[PDB]
Amino acid sequence: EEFDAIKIALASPDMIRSWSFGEVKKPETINYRTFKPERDGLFCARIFGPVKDYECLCGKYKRLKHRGVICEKCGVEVTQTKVRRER
Amino acid sequence: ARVTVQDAVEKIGNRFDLVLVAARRARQMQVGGKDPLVPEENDKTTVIALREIEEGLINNQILDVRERQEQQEQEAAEL
Amino acid sequence: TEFLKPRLVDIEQVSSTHAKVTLEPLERGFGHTLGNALRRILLSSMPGCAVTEVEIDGVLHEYSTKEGVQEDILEILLNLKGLAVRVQGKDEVILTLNKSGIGPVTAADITHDGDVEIVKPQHVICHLTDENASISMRIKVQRGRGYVPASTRIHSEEDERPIGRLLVDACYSPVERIAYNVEAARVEQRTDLDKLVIEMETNGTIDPEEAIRRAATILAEQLEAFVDLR
Amino acid sequence: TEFLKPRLVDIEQVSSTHAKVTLEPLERGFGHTLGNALRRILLSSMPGCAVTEVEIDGVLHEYSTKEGVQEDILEILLNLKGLAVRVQGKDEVILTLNKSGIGPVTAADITHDGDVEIVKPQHVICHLTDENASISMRIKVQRGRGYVPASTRIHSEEDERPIGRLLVDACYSPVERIAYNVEAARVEQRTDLDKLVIEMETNGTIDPEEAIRRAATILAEQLEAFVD
Amino acid sequence: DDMKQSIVKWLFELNAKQREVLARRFGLLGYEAATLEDVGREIGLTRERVRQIQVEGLRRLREILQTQGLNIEALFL
Amino acid sequence: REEAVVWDILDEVIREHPVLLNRAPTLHRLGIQAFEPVLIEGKAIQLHPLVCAAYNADFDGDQMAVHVPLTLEAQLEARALMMSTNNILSPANGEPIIVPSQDVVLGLYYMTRDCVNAKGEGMVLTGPKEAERLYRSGLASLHARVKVRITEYEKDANGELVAKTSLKDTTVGRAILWMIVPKGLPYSIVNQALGKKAISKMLNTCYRILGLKPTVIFADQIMYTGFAYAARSGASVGIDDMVIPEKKHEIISEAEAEVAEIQEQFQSGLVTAGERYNKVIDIWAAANDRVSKAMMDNLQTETVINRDGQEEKQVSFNSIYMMADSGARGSAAQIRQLAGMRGLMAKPDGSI
Amino acid sequence: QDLVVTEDDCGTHEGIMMTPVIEGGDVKEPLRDRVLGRVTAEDVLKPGTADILVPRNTLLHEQWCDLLEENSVDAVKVRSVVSCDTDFGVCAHCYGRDLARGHIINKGEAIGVIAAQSIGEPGTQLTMRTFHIGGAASRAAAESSIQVKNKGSIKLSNVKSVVNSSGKLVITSRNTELKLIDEFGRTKESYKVPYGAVLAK
Amino acid sequence: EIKELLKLGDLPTSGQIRLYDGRTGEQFERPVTVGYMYMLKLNHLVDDKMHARSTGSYSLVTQQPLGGKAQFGGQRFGEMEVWALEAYGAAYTLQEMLTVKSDDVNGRTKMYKNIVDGNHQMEPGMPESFNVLLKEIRSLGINIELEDE
Amino acid sequence: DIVLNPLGVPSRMNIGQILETHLGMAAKGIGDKINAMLKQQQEVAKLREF
Amino acid sequence: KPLVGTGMERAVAVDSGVTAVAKRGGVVQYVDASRIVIKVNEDEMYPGEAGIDIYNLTKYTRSNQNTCINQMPCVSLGEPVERGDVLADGPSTDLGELALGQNMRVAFMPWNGYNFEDSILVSERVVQEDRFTTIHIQELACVSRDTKLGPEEITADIPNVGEAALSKLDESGIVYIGAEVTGGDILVGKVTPKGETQLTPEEKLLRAIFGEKASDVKDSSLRVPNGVSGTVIDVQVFTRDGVEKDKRA
Amino acid sequence: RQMLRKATIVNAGSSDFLEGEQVEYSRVKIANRELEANGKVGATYSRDLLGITKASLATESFISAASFQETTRVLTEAAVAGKRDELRGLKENVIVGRLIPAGTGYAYHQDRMRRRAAG
Ligand SMILES: Nc1nc2c(ncn2[C@H]2CC[C@@H](COP(=O)(O)OP(=O)(O)OP(=O)(O)O)O2)c(=O)[nH]1
Ligand SMILES: [Mg+2]
Ligand SMILES: [Mg+2]
Ligand SMILES: [Zn+2]
Numbered sequence A: 001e002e003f004d005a006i007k008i009a010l011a012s013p014d015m016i017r018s019w020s021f022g023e024v025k026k027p028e029t030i031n032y033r034t035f036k037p038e039r040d041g042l043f044c045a046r047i048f049g050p051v052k053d054y055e056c057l058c059g060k061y062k063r064l065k066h067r068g069v070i071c072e073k074c075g076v077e078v079t080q081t082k083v084r085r086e087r
Numbered sequence B: 001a002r003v004t005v006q007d008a009v010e011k012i013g014n015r016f017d018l019v020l021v022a023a024r025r026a027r028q029m030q031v032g033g034k035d036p037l038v039p040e041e042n043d044k045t046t047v048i049a050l051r052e053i054e055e056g057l058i059n060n061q062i063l064d065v066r067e068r069q070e071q072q073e074q075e076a077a078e079l
Numbered sequence C: 001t002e003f004l005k006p007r008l009v010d011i012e013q014v015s016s017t018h019a020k021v022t023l024e025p026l027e028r029g030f031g032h033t034l035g036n037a038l039r040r041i042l043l044s045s046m047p048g049c050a051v052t053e054v055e056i057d058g059v060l061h062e063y064s065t066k067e068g069v070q071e072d073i074l075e076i077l078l079n080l081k082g083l084a085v086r087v088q089g090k091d092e093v094i095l096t097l098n099k100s101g102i103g104p105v106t107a108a109d110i111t112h113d114g115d116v117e118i119v120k121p122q123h124v125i126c127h128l129t130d131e132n133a134s135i136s137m138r139i140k141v142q143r144g145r146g147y148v149p150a151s152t153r154i155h156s157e158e159d160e161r162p163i164g165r166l167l168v169d170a171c172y173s174p175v176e177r178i179a180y181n182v183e184a185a186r187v188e189q190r191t192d193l194d195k196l197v198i199e200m201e202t203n204g205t206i207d208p209e210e211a212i213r214r215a216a217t218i219l220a221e222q223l224e225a226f227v228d229l230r
Numbered sequence D: 001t002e003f004l005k006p007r008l009v010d011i012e013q014v015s016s017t018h019a020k021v022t023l024e025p026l027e028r029g030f031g032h033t034l035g036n037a038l039r040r041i042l043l044s045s046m047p048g049c050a051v052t053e054v055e056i057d058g059v060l061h062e063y064s065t066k067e068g069v070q071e072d073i074l075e076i077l078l079n080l081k082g083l084a085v086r087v088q089g090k091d092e093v094i095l096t097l098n099k100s101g102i103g104p105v106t107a108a109d110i111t112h113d114g115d116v117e118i119v120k121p122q123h124v125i126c127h128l129t130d131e132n133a134s135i136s137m138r139i140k141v142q143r144g145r146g147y148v149p150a151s152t153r154i155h156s157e158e159d160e161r162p163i164g165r166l167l168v169d170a171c172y173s174p175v176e177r178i179a180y181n182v183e184a185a186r187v188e189q190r191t192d193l194d195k196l197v198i199e200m201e202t203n204g205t206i207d208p209e210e211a212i213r214r215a216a217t218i219l220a221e222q223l224e225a226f227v228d
Numbered sequence E: 001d002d003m004k005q006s007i008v009k010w011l012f013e014l015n016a017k018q019r020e021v022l023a024r025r026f027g028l029l030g031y032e033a034a035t036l037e038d039v040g041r042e043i044g045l046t047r048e049r050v051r052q053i054q055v056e057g058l059r060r061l062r063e064i065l066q067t068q069g070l071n072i073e074a075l076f077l
Numbered sequence F: 001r002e003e004a005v006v007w008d009i010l011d012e013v014i015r016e017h018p019v020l021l022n023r024a025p026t027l028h029r030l031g032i033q034a035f036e037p038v039l040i041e042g043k044a045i046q047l048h049p050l051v052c053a054a055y056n057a058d059f060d061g062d063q064m065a066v067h068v069p070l071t072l073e074a075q076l077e078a079r080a081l082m083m084s085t086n087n088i089l090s091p092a093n094g095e096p097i098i099v100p101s102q103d104v105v106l107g108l109y110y111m112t113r114d115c116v117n118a119k120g121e122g123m124v125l126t127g128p129k130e131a132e133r134l135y136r137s138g139l140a141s142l143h144a145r146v147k148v149r150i151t152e153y154e155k156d157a158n159g160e161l162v163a164k165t166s167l168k169d170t171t172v173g174r175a176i177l178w179m180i181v182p183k184g185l186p187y188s189i190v191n192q193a194l195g196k197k198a199i200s201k202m203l204n205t206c207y208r209i210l211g212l213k214p215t216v217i218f219a220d221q222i223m224y225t226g227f228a229y230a231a232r233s234g235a236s237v238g239i240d241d242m243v244i245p246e247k248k249h250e251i252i253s254e255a256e257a258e259v260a261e262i263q264e265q266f267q268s269g270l271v272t273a274g275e276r277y278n279k280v281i282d283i284w285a286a287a288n289d290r291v292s293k294a295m296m297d298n299l300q301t302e303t304v305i306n307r308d309g310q311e312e313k314q315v316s317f318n319s320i321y322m323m324a325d326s327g328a329r330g331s332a333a334q335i336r337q338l339a340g341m342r343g344l345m346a347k348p349d350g351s352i
Numbered sequence G: 001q002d003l004v005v006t007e008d009d010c011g012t013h014e015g016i017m018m019t020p021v022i023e024g025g026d027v028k029e030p031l032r033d034r035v036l037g038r039v040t041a042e043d044v045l046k047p048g049t050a051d052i053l054v055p056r057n058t059l060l061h062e063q064w065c066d067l068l069e070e071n072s073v074d075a076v077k078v079r080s081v082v083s084c085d086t087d088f089g090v091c092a093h094c095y096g097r098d099l100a101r102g103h104i105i106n107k108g109e110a111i112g113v114i115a116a117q118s119i120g121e122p123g124t125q126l127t128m129r130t131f132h133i134g135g136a137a138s139r140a141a142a143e144s145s146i147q148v149k150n151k152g153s154i155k156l157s158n159v160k161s162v163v164n165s166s167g168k169l170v171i172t173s174r175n176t177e178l179k180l181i182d183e184f185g186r187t188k189e190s191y192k193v194p195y196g197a198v199l200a201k
Numbered sequence H: 001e002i003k004e005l006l007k008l009g010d011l012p013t014s015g016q017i018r019l020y021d022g023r024t025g026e027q028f029e030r031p032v033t034v035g036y037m038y039m040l041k042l043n044h045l046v047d048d049k050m051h052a053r054s055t056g057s058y059s060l061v062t063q064q065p066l067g068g069k070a071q072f073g074g075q076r077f078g079e080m081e082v083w084a085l086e087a088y089g090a091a092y093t094l095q096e097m098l099t100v101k102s103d104d105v106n107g108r109t110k111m112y113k114n115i116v117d118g119n120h121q122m123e124p125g126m127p128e129s130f131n132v133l134l135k136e137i138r139s140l141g142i143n144i145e146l147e148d149e
Numbered sequence I: 001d002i003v004l005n006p007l008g009v010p011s012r013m014n015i016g017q018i019l020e021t022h023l024g025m026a027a028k029g030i031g032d033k034i035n036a037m038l039k040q041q042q043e044v045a046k047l048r049e050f
Numbered sequence J: 001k002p003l004v005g006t007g008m009e010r011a012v013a014v015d016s017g018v019t020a021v022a023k024r025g026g027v028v029q030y031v032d033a034s035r036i037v038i039k040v041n042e043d044e045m046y047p048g049e050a051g052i053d054i055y056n057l058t059k060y061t062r063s064n065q066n067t068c069i070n071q072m073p074c075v076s077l078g079e080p081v082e083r084g085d086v087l088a089d090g091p092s093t094d095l096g097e098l099a100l101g102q103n104m105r106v107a108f109m110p111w112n113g114y115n116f117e118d119s120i121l122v123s124e125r126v127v128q129e130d131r132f133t134t135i136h137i138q139e140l141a142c143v144s145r146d147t148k149l150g151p152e153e154i155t156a157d158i159p160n161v162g163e164a165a166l167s168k169l170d171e172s173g174i175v176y177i178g179a180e181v182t183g184g185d186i187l188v189g190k191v192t193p194k195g196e197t198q199l200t201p202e203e204k205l206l207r208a209i210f211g212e213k214a215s216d217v218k219d220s221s222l223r224v225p226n227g228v229s230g231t232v233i234d235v236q237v238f239t240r241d242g243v244e245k246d247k248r249a
Numbered sequence K: 001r002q003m004l005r006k007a008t009i010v011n012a013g014s015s016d017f018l019e020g021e022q023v024e025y026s027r028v029k030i031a032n033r034e035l036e037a038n039g040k041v042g043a044t045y046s047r048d049l050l051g052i053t054k055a056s057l058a059t060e061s062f063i064s065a066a067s068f069q070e071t072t073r074v075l076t077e078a079a080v081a082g083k084r085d086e087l088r089g090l091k092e093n094v095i096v097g098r099l100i101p102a103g104t105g106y107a108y109h110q111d112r113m114r115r116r117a118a119g
Helices: A013-019 A081-085 B006-012 B015-032 B045-055 B060-078 C030-044 C073-081 C208-228 D030-044 D073-081 D150-154 D208-224 E002-011 E016-026 E036-043 E047-071 F004-014 F049-055 F072-080 F103-112 F127-137 F172-178 F196-209 F212-233 F248-268 F273-300 F319-326 F332-339 G062-071 G111-133 H002-008 H079-087 H091-098 H105-117 H128-138 I016-039 I044-049 J008-015 J124-128 J163-167 J201-210 K025-038 K053-058 K062-068 K071-081 K090-096 K104-115
Strands: A003-010 C007-012 C018-026 C047-056 C092-100 C103-106 C124-128 C134-145 C175-184 C194-202 D007-012 D018-026 D047-056 D092-100 D103-106 D124-128 D134-145 D175-184 D194-202 F019-022 F032-035 F065-067 F123-125 F145-155 F161-171 F303-307 F310-314 G005-007 G016-018 G076-078 G153-157 G161-163 G169-171 G176-181 G187-193 H032-039 H142-148 I002-004 J026-032 J035-039 J052-056 J086-089 J102-108 J186-188 K006-009 K022-024 K045-047
Touching: A003 K071, A081 H128, B006 B015, B006 B045, B006 F212, B015 B045, B015 B060, B015 F072, B015 K104, B045 F072, C007 C208, C018 C030, C018 C208, C030 C175, C030 C194, C030 C208, C030 D030, C030 D208, C047 C073, C073 C124, C092 C103, C092 C124, C194 C208, C208 D007, C208 D030, C208 D208, D018 D030, D018 D208, D030 D175, D030 D194, D030 D208, D030 F127, D047 D073, D073 D124, D073 F123, D092 D124, D175 F127, D194 D208, E002 E016, E002 J201, E016 E036, E016 E047, E016 J201, E036 E047, E047 J201, F032 F049, F032 H079, F049 F212, F072 H091, F103 F172, F103 F196, F103 F212, F103 F319, F123 F127, F127 F145, F127 F172, F145 F172, F161 F172, F196 F212, F248 F273, F273 F319, F273 F332, F319 F332, G016 G076, G111 H079, H002 I016, H032 I002, H032 I016, H079 H091, H079 K090, H091 K104, H128 H142, H142 K071, I016 I044, I016 J102, J035 J086, K006 K025, K022 K025, K025 K045, K053 K062, K062 K071, K062 K090
Parallel strands: F123 F145, I002 J102
Antiparallel strands: A003 H142, C007 C018, C018 C194, C047 C134, C092 C134, C103 C124, C175 C194, D007 D018, D018 D194, D047 D134, D092 D134, D103 D124, D175 D194, F019 F032, F019 F065, F145 F161, F303 F310, G153 G176, G161 G169, G176 G187, H032 J102, J026 J035, J035 J052, K006 K022, K006 K045
């Protein structure tokens, strides 16, 4: 990480796509009943990451054993929740 | 010293370098468990390094010379 | 050393509370030396007896109000701080106070215990308004010295916490006021020779005479340490 | 009474003249009670010897000047105040000082006298300029206590007072300086507890340690009149 | 961190037969927290043997507690 | 559980560990200073008086931030660079920021300043110790004129200090202050009546001759003695201490008929609003100075004390005058409003 | 923020001639105090040009400054931050003494910050300070007459005045500086004469 | 009228009295103004204002410690306070305050462990506030990249 | 009861506190006379006079 | 009271409303540390309704700034009073006059820097006489909410809690009236339903060792804020209409 | 000194000056030192005064310019220029939470600058 300088420049449409991990199509935040992230919504776990550390949304994979294991069913990567601040 | 650090500034000169050198020495005693040249007298590693600098035992050049010596002794042992 | 000791001369007792004590002959400068040294012990160190704990039946805390009583419990407790008590033998005595009917509850309504002596029996504690109203309480008097606040005493021992005990301030120190005057004792030869006039004002309990004796004793006890150990 | 006695802890003797004495533990307020009580006795009640009267031959008053002597008589007298003297037996001794020639007149030039002991024989008294000049005086040392000024002595004693007898201040008190400091003695439980630091400065005749013992002794002797 | 570090040292303080069971079952040095049947099948031990190693493992912890229990007894508030 | 052994361990950790004190607003670097902490019972932070100047700290409820330098490096930067003792001079101008004020100034002023005869005029002492002993014995005022023998220590061409003994005509008080004065300095420093202006010079002189540790010790000593003698003195504030000049009403009626004559000349025709505004402001501004100077003559001296025989004039020991002259607190400007005339007040526009 | 002591000595001769601020008769700020702790330059000697008195690279201590006063030096070229040649910072010598330390500034010290803080502080402190503490305004506008405190001869630099029918010199210059010269010929008091002034002499 | 009332009390017209020091017993060398001032205890009690914090909960986005005693907060180290450390030398104290004491998440835990281990070593990192700043500028559609050595 | 600093008056220019203190003592002076007369009972006529 | 007043003291105390003032006057029939009953005089007393005024006094109540509001009776039993006489003193009022603080013997003079910049040196006698001792009544609430997992319980049955702590709570889980409390003591015991706790292996081991599984519930009890210490004067319970009341309620 | 930071240039040197570019005085002096030794086109310069606010925005660090004032405008002009901030100043280093290039940090910082020469 230790770096020399910082540069700023106009973002290309394609540059913006690079940082993105998916297109948020829906305004849906979370489910009113299971307060979990909606499908392809603004808090989508499929795009930004898991709500809980090393745990997919539908709950099939748990614990630090499962590492980067994208759950086939719900489509949520088993990594730390920290990722949702960076993705 | 205990109260004021003026004498130790007069030995090395640059207040900034005084702090680096006293830091480096205090780290040796903190981690390495290097024995203090002056009686400890229940003094913290911060103050002991300043005593040693005041009396003119500890110094950037001296510390570098003894670093090379211990480091070459370890090279000798490995080979 | 032509050593020149004073001796207790005159004890004017103006009242049980106020008493003037002349003292001579004193050598020059010993007037203020003894005068202040004694004043300090007489204010800070004097041992006495004072109300430490009070338990009233039908009263859980000091902020409540009892019906048929003009004064809130706090005001009653502040009156019990002013209650003048002598314990003869024991260090700790629990006195019982049961009274009913219309009237100013005085200190005389406490059950006179044999060894314990209430200096001011007319001391006001409670005013009972309604005739049907009765008050019953158990007042604990301990012996100590100086000033021990309830807040300083609610952060020390506290081995047992019986929901029902109220801690109130109790000025152990019997001495209310003290001042010393150095007057000239135009002595046979010496005109620099002086007298020490100590005006003491205590509440009840301690006798002026006895208190001065005790204060001089404490000072002389502390000097033994310096005369002895080098 | 949960009585709490102090004990003499540390005696730093910086010099025979200066000595610091820490004292603990003291209960709150006894620091100043004992500190001041002792300070007053040690200044105005410590018994000692000092020059009271000086008679110099060829000197009628203290304001004149003697030829062959650098210092005016007043300055000479001020040096005799600083003269450290012990009398062993007698309460009053008259010492004789006769000296001549060029040189700093010291306290050794005083004619000994068996019982009397001069603590500082190198003490400067007079400087003699011309060799033909000779100085002769009779120095009276009395034993008393505290500080007795000449102005407080003429107002009280109005008996024999002939011209020529030079009266100078007589600091009987061997104690030159005393100050007491109350510092906090953070004690097992009590933070209220304090220590008493007494700095004494005497001249050499009397020992700091023994002077303190003595002052406390006089103080306890005055408490014998209050029965217990 | 203090607890996790102590456990590693606690594993190499008691028996190697019991520490083995608890390490593989809890997933401390292992990976998958094997339940009763999986731990038994591995070491070849039986269901009753699981209770026997468990009871022996708790007795070993009681020793650490009476020595350094100064920390465990403080869990009572 | 706050167990008793924990206090003893905490005492051991805090030893020689510096803590940063900060006050808002942090205007210049001395708004942060490092100190060695002293564990105290009670909830308030205790600040050294002499650094109150740098923080602009006055204890009517101000608060401070505490910060703990954690690393060895941070501890060393606090002890060496940011320590109170090491930041004595203002980085803005060369002068010492660590300067006595209020009680301390007043006490040293009370000690140094001289009075006519008093107790033991024209005595002779062996050194400041006989003087201290005389004062505390009650045979001498601090303001008694006397000739003591003090031995000053003057630096030579090298690092060696030269000793010199000579008789000085000062007062008991100044002699006893000499005891605080470190060796190297002249006795002429204490021989004047000391104010805050003179004490600042004293500490700067001491810093440039002797060096840092001596000035540090000397500063503390000055503070201790200054408070101590301030309290002994018992200087206070009565209403009779505020003296009105007898000749105020005259100056004012004169000034008042004068301004009246210019207001009548205003309807006549020699005057604009600006011209008369200037003329009235000038008349009152001169009257204010006049009444103030009347008060300050009447107050500053106007001490009739009989010297050993006849009458003399000397400086007044009136409480408020001493406070002003010493620079302990109020200035002549404030005391104008107390005892003299309050003066022309200026509107929020700035126009008077 | 960026300004830091980078170098010890850039070796520059250049400096800004600092005169003694003598405004309003009594010298407001002396030259001694204005050049105290500052590195000198251009071999500033004493009046009589025949021997050097001060070097081109030294520290002006209280001792050097006291010597300057016996000789009464008026003008001194000293090395300044502005004329320093150091790229990306300034030299310890161009700056001079760290006023907070009482000796030559240490290389690496953040000088700019200290400068900004020290200019800023008094303003911010004098805002709350003079205001809550005073009520009235005790100004004094009576700047009518110049009266001279010490005897001497009138020196008028920058002045163009016309003689009026009174006999008197009525000034009609905008910038007018009346100075008070002694015997030897030093400037000691100044006095800003205005436009429309009647001069006595 | 006040002096007339004082005479009725047999108190001094100056309203100054002789006082004696409780410690020494000796008199103060001049009269002192004594009397009764009606005094008020204001709501500002030290009990309510005293506050201290070593480590606590941390803010949601910025990851810096919270403010205020009710939230068990760290004191704010403001621009003004930073400049003071800049004027001094104090670079480690400043970095401390920026990093392991505020945002730097890994740094603060690691340095806590070191201080209990008695190492007194910093091991600094990257403040989480800056990571956010980057994300907020990329959300504006400005590419802001870290260029490596 | 309380020892306040003289130097926080002439700078502050609140002289009210000093007048309050002088009058406060005079008020208490007369309270101390009445307290003394009540302690010694004395005459209702004499109390009335004073 | 203030020894040096102005005269607005009485006006302010009466007009503030904090003092009980007599509308009708007459003679006091009955005083009590709670109530004052006055029998009205025939001249103001109307012949319609019974002519007995009852003023109920407000006892030790919380202010907005958590200060104490206490009314004490001014008059004695059987005292004749007019209209507009003060019958009971409010919190900062003497017999009818406004009393914001306490007058003291003050001396203007330095001490050993103990009054440096406005710093104040006070006698121990002030603390002893409990002058400027102040009463603060603090109101703490404990809320039982309903969550997605289920309703929170206010039982005394709280996982991982000493008998020392539970001694002061009664059957329902509520502290007793009169009980002295200090920081960390539990005032109202409350537990919150936890949904299935996937534990770290260490916690699995630890929960196995003590066997204190303590059901599917947490500890969210209302406890005294740290360093504040007081006596419980009063307790109030607000329940919903449908829900079965606590024994203590 | 900080006010008189920038200078306008007339004519060209061996770099890209031409008519009336505003460049910092230090950098044009550096150019002039190598130019006078080697030769190339000599460049007349003229120092410009900048008053405080503009002088702070004229600094060739955009992290300092942004932190000061006018952040929206500063970042658009930097984004369009593709400007690169090498972090020489103090504010820049405080923002990234690094060692200040001054006081204690000057030792360490000068060691990093020589690590740029090799390894
Ligand atoms: N920035 C800032 N500082 C303030 C403000 N009010 C007070 N301060 C700081 C600077 C002055 C200091 C103390 O304020 P004071 O009003 O007591 O003034 P002082 O300078 O101590 O004067 P005095 O002798 O009248 O007490 O606290 C404010 O509104 N803003
Ligand atoms: Mg203020
Ligand atoms: Mg303030
Ligand atoms: Zn899944």
